[PDB]
């Protein structure tokens, strides 16, 4: 059923992190949302019913670039 | 290489709550330099990123992970403490 | 680093997507997760968070909210 998404999001300056945070906040069936990794530059989402290649459009459209790294099921 | 992980710091991670806590850790490297590090399940599978190329990795029980991974490009697996 | 609890009257279209949004917006930040069966808390995790503003604009934009805890 849960999907977890993990996304790189380019630090190009003026809280672009707290952005991206944000637009992924937003996206219909968030469960969970965290900043990780070891340079602190990665989201990992976790819901359902969510389309990772619209969330890279939308990222890289509203707030900078960003990259998708992780697509894997959360059922276990 | 055998890539030493008993002495890597932990990944920066996020214990998501209404899923189940993840068993391993996992760390990328590219020519032995650590790229980045993070959870997964064992005995369970994950579709990732590695450099250039989407790479299906699969992990066993004990968090031993595998995957055609490019060339200079590995994903090591282990317990995480008390799993 | 703080952890903040706060639960949401979420009963509409919408209105988690409002929430987690403005939460997640918020300086400071590190995590923010529903939890709950119902999914009507939030759990926000960061550093120097201000209760009183992330609990006013949630009143304002969302719905009622009530503190449940500050550590
Ligand atoms: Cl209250």
């Known amino acids: ?76 | 290489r055998a890539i030493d992980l008993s002495r890597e710091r932990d990944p920066n991670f996020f214990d998501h709550p209404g899923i189940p806590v993840p068993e391993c850790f996992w760390f990328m490297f590219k020519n032995n330099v650590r790229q980045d590090a993070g959870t997964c399940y064992s005995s369970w599978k994950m579709d990732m990123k590695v450099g250039p190329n989407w790479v299906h990795i699969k992990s066993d029980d004990n968090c031993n992970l595998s995957g055609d991974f490019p060339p200079g490009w590995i994903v090591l697996g282990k317990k995480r403490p008390g799993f």
Do not use: W
Not at chain 1, 13 to 33: E, I, P, Q, Y
Not at chain 1, 65 to 75: G, K, R, T, Y
């Open chain 1, 1 to 76: 059923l849960k999907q977890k998404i993990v996304i790189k999001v380019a630090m190009e300056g003026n809280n672009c992190r707290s952005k991206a945070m944000a637009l992924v906040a937003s996206t219909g069936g968030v469960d969970s949302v965290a900043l990780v990794g070891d340079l602190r530059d990665k989201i990992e989402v976790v819901g359902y019913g969510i389309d990772p290649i619209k969330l890279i459009s939308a990222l890289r459209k509203k707030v900078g670039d960003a990259e998708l790294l992780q697509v894997s099921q959360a059922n276990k």
